[PDB]
Amino acid sequence: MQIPASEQETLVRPKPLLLKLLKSVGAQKDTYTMKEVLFYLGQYIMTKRLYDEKQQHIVYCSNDLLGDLFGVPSFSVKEHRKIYTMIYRNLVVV
Numbered sequence: 191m192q193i194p195a196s197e198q199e200t201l202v203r204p205k206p207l208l209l210k211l212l213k214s215v216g217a218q219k220d221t222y223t224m225k226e227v228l229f230y231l232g233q234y235i236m237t238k239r240l241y242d243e244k245q246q247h248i249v250y251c252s253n254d255l256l257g258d259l260f261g262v263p264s265f266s267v268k269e270h271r272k273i274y275t276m277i278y279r280n281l282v283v284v
């Protein structure tokens with residue numbers, strides 16, 4: 191896998207906007223493992239149908255809160271380094 195699995199176990203504290211986003215799809219806590227944050231971001235992208243229907247590795251967010259948080263108009267789910275950095279922009283480590 192692109193990023194070692196041990197990275198998903200890191201305990202993190204989402205900043206206010208990201209925390210609001212996570213809770214809007216049913217997250218229940220103030221702190222998460224990175225694996226949990228990824229899961230809930232996945233539910234958000236699904237629920238708002240932001241992925242390209244035919245090219246499902248592309249997520250569009252130029253006009254969505256997700257784009258505000260990530261700082262991009264769209265991204266590929268295949269490029270994990272960028273996902274890591276985009277998420278960490280919105281976190282502090284516990």
Ligand SMILES: CC(C)(C)NC(=O)[C@@H](c1c(C(=O)O)[nH]c2cc(Cl)ccc12)N(C=O)Cc1ccc(OCc2ccc(Cl)cc2)cc1
Pocket residue numbers: 193197198224228229230231232233235236241246249267268270273274
């Ligand atoms: C677009 C769709 C169909 C709604 N979901 C997925 O594609 C996807 C997924 C999930 C998921 O929990 O399945 N969560 C995602 C979050 C983002 Cl930001 C983008 C994709 C996912 N699940 C993929 O296999 C895709 C995925 C892609 C990258 C990924 O992790 C990168 C990463 C690894 C480790 C760290 Cl520490 C940080 C980031 C996790 C899941």
